[PDB]
Ligand binder design. Structure first.
Ligand SMILES: COc1cc(-c2ccc3c(c2)Nc2c(cccc2OCCN2CCOCC2)NC3=O)ccc1[N+](=O)[O-]
Length: 268
């Protein structure tokens, strides 16, 4: 079939030091895809390993001399970041459904021995049905290989979302770090604000949290049931921090809140 290999770049989805991301529309089928135009070898290698409904799908890559093209799943709903209203958050049933999907994606990645290392609402994309997709494996790494866990030591991520062990310990387990950033994402969805610039005792907001001063912002805005979950996630000792199997047993995680996607209906 002629011209099915041709794509038109119609809008900028992102741009930075790495290069740029464009929305590409197939000339024949009008299929929409995200094309990342560029560390990069590792991103492609990690992406070739991934196949999950809550992970941005990788379709392939092509090299045109010095330029690398990564063909990725286009998520028309944009970034979770833009669903968070500043200092408000979003309705608790929406945040619960996004959090369930985030956990499904993170369980999958950890099950194949991959850690994302930069979980934040900018890297959580939404498709046409508001299904969450974990995006950008540029900072990701393999933490388990041949059933042997390797401890990490590299400073990676974004300070408001990083686990305190990354700033205090030479080595750390990969999985509690991603669990911690998911708790920060949950805090942002429910309060529309980040609790601290970084998780250090020098940060007053962080010291206040360890002193259980939940009568303060952002905690005062969060209902007692999701707040009890955050108390288990945002635990300084990564060995005492709740694991994802235990997050799935949490009371708020399993609380019925949200009705399914509205279906057309008539009466009489
Ligand atoms: C894989 O790595 C990346 C991927 C993207 C990306 C890819 C696809 C979409 C997307 C972003 N976001 C997106 C979509 C649809 C509409 C808008 C979108 O982005 C919002 C634009 N932001 C930047 C400009 O200012 C507003 C917020 N859906 C999308 O599917 C952006 C940056 C990187 N990166 O390397 O830093």
């Amino acid at each position: 079939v002629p011209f099915v290999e041709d794509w038109d770049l119609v809008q900028t989805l992102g741009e930075g030091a790495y290069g740029e991301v464009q929305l590409a529309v197939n000339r024949v089928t009008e299929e929409a895809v995200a094309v990342k135009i560029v560390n990069i070898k590792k991103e492609i290698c990690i992406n070739k390993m991934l196949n999950h409904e809550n992970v941005v799908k990788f379709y392939g890559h092509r090299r045109e001399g010095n330029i690398q093209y990564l063909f990725l799943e286009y998520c028309s709903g944009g970034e979770l970041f833009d669903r968070i209203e500043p200092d408000i958050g979003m309705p608790e049933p929406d945040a619960q459904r996004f959090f369930h999907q985030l956990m499904a994606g993170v369980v999958y990645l950890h099950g194949i021995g991959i850690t994302h290392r930069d979980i934040k609402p900018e890297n959580l994309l939404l498709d046409e049905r508001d299904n969450l997709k974990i995006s950008d494996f540029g900072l990701a790494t393999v933490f388990r290989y041949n059933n042997r866990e390797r401890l990490l030591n590299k400073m990676c991520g974004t300070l408001p979302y990083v686990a305190p062990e990354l700033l205090k310990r030479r080595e750390f387990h990969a999985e509690p770090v991603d669990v911690w950033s998911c708790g920060i994402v949950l805090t942002a969805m429910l309060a529309g604000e980040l609790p601290w610039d970084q998780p250090s005792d020098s940060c007053q907001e962080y010291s206040d949290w360890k002193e259980k001063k939940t009568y303060l912002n952002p905690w005062k805005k969060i209902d007692s049931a999701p707040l009890a979950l955050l108390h288990k996630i945002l635990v300084e000792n990564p060995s005492a921090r709740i694991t994802i199997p235990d997050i799935k047993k949490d009371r708020w995680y399993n609380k019925p809140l949200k009705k399914g996607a509205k279906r057309p209906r008539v009466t009489s």
